[PDB]
Amino acid sequence: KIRIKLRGFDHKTLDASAQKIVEAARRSGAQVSGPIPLPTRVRRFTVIRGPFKHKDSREHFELRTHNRLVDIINPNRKTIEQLMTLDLPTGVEIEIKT
Amino acid sequence: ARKALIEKAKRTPKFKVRAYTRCVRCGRARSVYRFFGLCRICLRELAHKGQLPGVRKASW
Amino acid sequence: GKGDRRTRRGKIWRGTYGKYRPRK
Amino acid sequence: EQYYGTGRRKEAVARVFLRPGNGKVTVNGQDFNEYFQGLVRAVAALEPLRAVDALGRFDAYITVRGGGKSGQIDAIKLGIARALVQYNPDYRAKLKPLGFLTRDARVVERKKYGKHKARRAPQYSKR
Amino acid sequence: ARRRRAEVRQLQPDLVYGDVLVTAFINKIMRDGKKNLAARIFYDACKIIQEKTGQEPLKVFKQAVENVKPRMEVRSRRVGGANYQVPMEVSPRRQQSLALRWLVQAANQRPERRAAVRIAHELMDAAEGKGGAVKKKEDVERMAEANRAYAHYRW
Amino acid sequence: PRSLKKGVFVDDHLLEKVLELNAKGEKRLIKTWSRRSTIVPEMVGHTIAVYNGKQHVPVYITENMVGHKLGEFAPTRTYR
Amino acid sequence: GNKIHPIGFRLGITRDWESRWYAGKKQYRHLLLEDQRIRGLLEKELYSAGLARVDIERAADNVAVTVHVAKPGVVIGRGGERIRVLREELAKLTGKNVALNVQEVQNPNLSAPLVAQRVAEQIERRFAVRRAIKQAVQRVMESGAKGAKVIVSGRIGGAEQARTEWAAQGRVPLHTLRANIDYGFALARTTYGVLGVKAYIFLGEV
Amino acid sequence: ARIAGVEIPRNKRVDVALTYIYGIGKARAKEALEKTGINPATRVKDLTEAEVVRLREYVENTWKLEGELRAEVAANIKRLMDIGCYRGLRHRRGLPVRGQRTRTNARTRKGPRKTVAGKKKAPRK
RNA sequence: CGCCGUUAGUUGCCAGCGGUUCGGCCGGGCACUCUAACGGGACUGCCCGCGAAAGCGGGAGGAAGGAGGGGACGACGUCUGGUCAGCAUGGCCCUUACGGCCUGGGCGACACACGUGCUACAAUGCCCACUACAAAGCGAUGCCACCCGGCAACGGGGAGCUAAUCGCAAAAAGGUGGGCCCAGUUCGGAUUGGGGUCUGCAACCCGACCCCAUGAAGCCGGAAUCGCUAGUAAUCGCGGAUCAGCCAUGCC
Ligand SMILES: [Mg+2]
Ligand SMILES: [Mg+2]
Ligand SMILES: [Mg+2]
Ligand SMILES: [Mg+2]
Ligand SMILES: [Mg+2]
Ligand SMILES: [Mg+2]
Ligand SMILES: [Mg+2]
Ligand SMILES: [Mg+2]
Ligand SMILES: [Mg+2]
Ligand SMILES: [Mg+2]
Ligand SMILES: [Mg+2]
Ligand SMILES: [Mg+2]
Ligand SMILES: [Mg+2]
Ligand SMILES: [Mg+2]
Ligand SMILES: [Mg+2]
Ligand SMILES: [Mg+2]
Ligand SMILES: [Mg+2]
Ligand SMILES: [Mg+2]
Ligand SMILES: [Mg+2]
Ligand SMILES: [Zn+2]
């Protein structure tokens, strides 16, 4: 029962590589618990627009971290062998527990 | 600011309460968002140049 | 109300707790 | 076995379950009146059943999550009105013109910068 | 209203008299968004309208509103001179608002301590012909037919 | 309503100096720049010169003013 | 006042981030700083190649710098003895083992950063500004492009009173997101002040 | 009845009444009614003469109140006035002792406004 | 943001049965709520009337109907507008000081005046007790459950949480009960005397907080004057950034 919390700053690149982690099978080998949504955490920064005065200007920036879960039950060893050099996203990260 | 006044470089500040921030890009000592290490003015510049990964115009 | 330190309303307004707004 | 509608209102969600019964409504593991104790607006959550003659012909197990009790009232009201239409699609005639089917999309307006409060504008002098 | 004539909003009827006027009153009685204890007042006031009078409260509330509605009022006018107090008619929409507003205001002048009581007595006194609300109405109409000379600016 | 807990504070370079002059006689005037330091009972006697950002001052030191901080006796600003 | 960065505005869609990695709130600060140092050592030494942009990516400790230059000649050198020196000079500031790549720019007259960069250098070589700009635009319009626009700031010609010179043709539709408008800014350190060269280049739609 | 030196709080609840003495507020009232076991709620006139006594015998012998306090504080100030103290100066001038601003807003320490002429050659303000 | 669908089940449940140390705590399933990716949905498309047309008025169906609600987004130009103290940067200027380091002081000075605010002057109220419903956020040399000591700030001990799972966290107005009874009051919390806590090398100048006592002015404000057309104003609490701490009632 392996645990895989996925997270990055882009979500087009997440759901398209969490999908690539569910390449054991659609549902014929190990169970597969589907790519789990799991709420995103939004940091915000609010900057005064110009240098020097003009209090009332302001402009909003956000940086949002999206998080997935997946989780596979009953890990056959060839399912793990696929967790080797099989990736393409650069801005996606990978926590793994069991 | 004064190039001299980056004795923020002083790794030992004697007391940890003389430790302060400064923009790592411009020296600004006064809106240095600690996440980025950048001041408010540099942050908006870098945000707009797309050199702060993941950072985006935010509206809601 | 909100100005008096030794009250419910007043302690709520100023973040704090104490004799007049027990933490629990 | 029962009948169901959702109904949301201003950050609040009710889930309405309609049993056939005596008129006993229960809201969040509690009696209907024990939950809206002393809120005069309460009785208006059940204004669908009142205006399709159902006030006492249904029991109602309702779960309610989020917001504040007065919005929960409006949201239950939508919840009921919807269950009561998937139980008998003909009920719309004596239900739609009353408005009970519409969902109140009136929601808190965002806080704008340089304002105090979305629209409250800071006060100025000399002009 | 520079573009459209701007319509009136339709307050949902009372929960206890199923009436629109009673919501309106309750709304004028309410302050700071506390609608619960504005209704908690008007109704407490209604218990009092009976335990002091054989009459049903709705019939009395309605009765007193009518005694406060002003058939005439003045609103000032800038001319080719200055301020002329032109006696105008008063639309049925504006009589509504004026009556209700005047009723609450009058009520809150009173020396009775509970709010329901003040509303109660004002609501009663106004039905029976007297009371501060009516006085700032018999007054209002007195400024009309006194500036009657300026009726020929009817707008 | 101030603040000296289970610590109590007196800046020490001035302290080792006054206790030193309590082996014999009292040095007329001591040049301090630390107004930071509370007064101990062992200071009652020798006149200490508290600074000012501008001038050391002849602060004679009575026993009626022990628990107080030094700078409480050398006014900073000048007024009318 | 007016006019947001046409890049930072479109950053959502039609234009992606120069450096695209992920990092926690105890790392982001550091990676960002070093990321900058790289751009600095890069924008100074690679001037001759005329670098449009520098993509930087990170992962299992390693760093994939993907430099975009008009003339990859000047970044290679003795058949290598330059791309090695620079992948080396990066290994000192970045203790994390770098990987320098080089990207051809098919059409320097279709990358706003270079177009502007072009104009900048002329203004220092005392070219005629008005023409420079009308020309610069044409060179961009002749190379396909649905539209383009250039702007020189102030003190055109040593002129004591700072001005602004213009030029632009085709469509340059700033308020439409669905655009793709490469933007580029070049500085011009002249004898008598500084000048700013902004370059807009519209192309495509969806 | 006479609780503390020349004090006479009548006709309200006992706790509220006790505060009409100088050294006593809501907290010493509560306390000294708990520790003498008189129901705080009773009106003053309905206090047992025996009660009134166990009340006084606490309050008076346990706390510095009224007169013996008013000149403890007064003479407490003269202390910081008689040493070279800063708070003393502030007491002597009549200016916010606890480290406030005085550019504006120190009315409560300063008394009413002593308004003076402001300009000699500048607009209307 | 509002309605609906598909994908997705270490958050969600008298939906449906089993167990209960009556907590979705346990088996167990994802229907529902939600979470968040991708889609549908609106078009003056349909009907009636005016119109040459664009469109206008109205009416159905619909979660929503003519720009459904709110953001981001600001033209050629104007002001020789703001900013060389964020950053660049031409010129001019100083170069045992117009550079540099300290320690202390100042930026916090008070006879006065203005701006923006906060807290009020109370009964549609204030106090105490019990009890009910949020959203958005933040958390490692951090948030701190829980236990013990203290009236308390807080100290000692200690669990969990790299957090949809642990914590900040109590939401508050509201509701039920009790008290106050028209009073400068159980309104208002300014001032001042005392005793403490914590942060920091250090709180005199000049920190925040807790406790005791003190309990000012203020009974709704002249001339004038500001905001707001709907989840708006009004009102109530909550969070973050900055930051050891904090003068935040400011700001987002
Ligand atoms: Mg603006
Ligand atoms: Mg400099
Ligand atoms: Mg600091
Ligand atoms: Mg009070
Ligand atoms: Mg609000
Ligand atoms: Mg020494
Ligand atoms: Mg759905
Ligand atoms: Mg069972
Ligand atoms: Mg048509
Ligand atoms: Mg100027
Ligand atoms: Mg200042
Ligand atoms: Mg001014
Ligand atoms: Mg305890
Ligand atoms: Mg009560
Ligand atoms: Mg008023
Ligand atoms: Mg408007
Ligand atoms: Mg207010
Ligand atoms: Mg802070
Ligand atoms: Mg706040
Ligand atoms: Zn900066």
Swiss-Prot record, chain A:
Gene Ontology biological process terms in this record: translation
Single GO term (MF): rRNA binding
SUPFAM superfamilies in UniProt: Ribosomal protein S10
InterPro entries: Ribosomal_uS10, Ribosomal_uS10_CS, Ribosomal_uS10_dom, Ribosomal_uS10_dom_sf
Key words of the record: Ribonucleoprotein, Ribosomal protein, RNA-binding, rRNA-binding
GO cellular component terms given for this protein: ribonucleoprotein complex; ribosome
PROSITE patterns: RIBOSOMAL_S10 (PS00361)
Keyword Ribosomal protein among record annotations: yes
Pfam families membership: Ribosomal_S10
Source organism superkingdom: Bacteria
Protein role: Involved in the binding of tRNA to the ribosomes. Part of the top of the 30S subunit head.
Assembly and binders: Part of the 30S ribosomal subunit. Forms a tight complex with proteins S3 and S14. Also contacts protein S9.
UniProt cross-references to HAMAP family, sorted A to Z: Ribosomal_uS10 (MF_00508)
Family (UniProt): Belongs to the universal ribosomal protein uS10 family.
Protein name, per record: Small ribosomal subunit protein uS10
Species of origin: Thermus thermophilus (strain ATCC 27634 / DSM 579 / HB8)
Gene coding for it: rpsJ
Curated annotation (Swiss-Prot), chain C:
UniProt keyword annotation of Iron present: no
Cellular component GO terms, alphabetical: ribonucleoprotein complex; ribosome
Position of the signal peptide: none
Region Disordered, annotated ranges: 1-24
Residues forming coiled coils: none
UniProt KW keywords: Ribonucleoprotein, Ribosomal protein, RNA-binding, rRNA-binding
Compositional bias of kind Basic residues: 1-12
InterPro entries: Ribosomal_bTHX (IPR031414), Ribosomal_bTHX/bTHXc/bTHXm (IPR030826)
Presence of keyword Transit peptide: no
Recorded GO MF terms: rRNA binding
Task of the protein: Binds at the top of the head of the 30S subunit. It stabilizes a number of different RNA elements and thus is important for subunit structure.
Homology family: Belongs to the bacterial ribosomal protein bTHX family.
Subunit comment: Part of the 30S ribosomal subunit.
Alphabetical list of NCBIfam families matching this protein: PRK14753.1, ribo_THX
Protein name, entry field: Small ribosomal subunit protein bTHX
Organism lineage: Bacteria, Thermotogati, Deinococcota, Deinococci, Thermales
From Swiss-Prot, chain F:
Keyword rRNA-binding in record: yes
GO cellular component: cytoplasm; small ribosomal subunit
Annotated InterPro entries: Ribosomal_uS19 (IPR002222), Ribosomal_uS19_bac-type (IPR005732), Ribosomal_uS19_CS (IPR020934), Ribosomal_uS19_SF (IPR023575)
Keywords: Ribonucleoprotein, Ribosomal protein, RNA-binding, rRNA-binding
One Gene Ontology term from the biological process aspect of the record: ribosomal small subunit assembly
TM segment ranges: none
Domain of life where this protein originates: Bacteria
GO MF term list: rRNA binding; structural constituent of ribosome
Keyword rRNA-binding attributed: yes
Pfam families: Ribosomal_S19 (PF00203)
Disulfide bonds: none
Subunit: Part of the 30S ribosomal subunit. Forms a loose dimer with protein S13.
Task performed by this protein: Located at the top of the head of the 30S subunit, extending towards the 50S subunit, which it may contact in the 70S complex. Contacts several RNA helices of the 16S rRNA.
Family: Belongs to the universal ribosomal protein uS19 family.
Protein name as annotated: Small ribosomal subunit protein uS19
Organism: Thermus thermophilus (strain ATCC 27634 / DSM 579 / HB8)
From Swiss-Prot, chain G:
Keyword Transmembrane: no
Source taxon at top rank: Bacteria
Ranges of residues in domain KH type-2: 38-106
Keyword RNA-binding among UniProt keywords: yes
Pfam families attached to this UniProt entry: KH_2 (PF07650), Ribosomal_S3_C (PF00189)
InterPro entries named among the record's database cross-references: KH_dom, KH_dom-like_a/b, KH_dom_type_2, KH_sf_prok-type, Ribosomal_S3_C_sf, Ribosomal_uS3_bac-typ, Ribosomal_uS3_C, Ribosomal_uS3_CS
MF terms (GO), sorted A to Z: mRNA binding; rRNA binding; structural constituent of ribosome
Keywords: Ribonucleoprotein, Ribosomal protein, RNA-binding, rRNA-binding
Gene Ontology biological process terms, A to Z: translation
GO cellular-component term (any): cytosolic small ribosomal subunit
Function: Binds the lower part of the 30S subunit head. Binds mRNA in the 70S ribosome, positioning it for translation.
Family: Belongs to the universal ribosomal protein uS3 family.
Xref: HAMAP family: Ribosomal_uS3_B
Subunit structure: Part of the 30S ribosomal subunit. Forms a tight complex with proteins S10 and S14.
Protein name: Small ribosomal subunit protein uS3
Organism in which the protein naturally occurs: Thermus thermophilus (strain ATCC 27634 / DSM 579 / HB8)
Lineage start: Bacteria, Thermotogati, Deinococcota, Deinococci, Thermales
